[PDB]
Amino acid sequence: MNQQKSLTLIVALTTSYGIGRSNSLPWKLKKEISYFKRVTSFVPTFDSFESMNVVLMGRKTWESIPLQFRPLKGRINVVITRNESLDLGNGIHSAKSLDHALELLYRTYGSESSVQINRIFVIGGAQLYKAAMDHPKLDRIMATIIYKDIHCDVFFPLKFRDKEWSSVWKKEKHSDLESWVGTKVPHGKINEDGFDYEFEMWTRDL
Ligand SMILES: NC(=O)C1=CN([C@@H]2O[C@H](COP(=O)(O)OP(=O)(O)OC[C@H]3O[C@@H](n4cnc5c(N)ncnc54)[C@H](OP(=O)(O)O)[C@@H]3O)[C@@H](O)[C@H]2O)C=CC1
Ligand SMILES: *COc1cc(Cc2cnc(N)nc2N)cc(C#CCCCC(=O)O)c1OC
Question: Which domains does the chain have, with CATH numbers?
Answer without folding.
Answer: 1-206 (3.40.430.10)
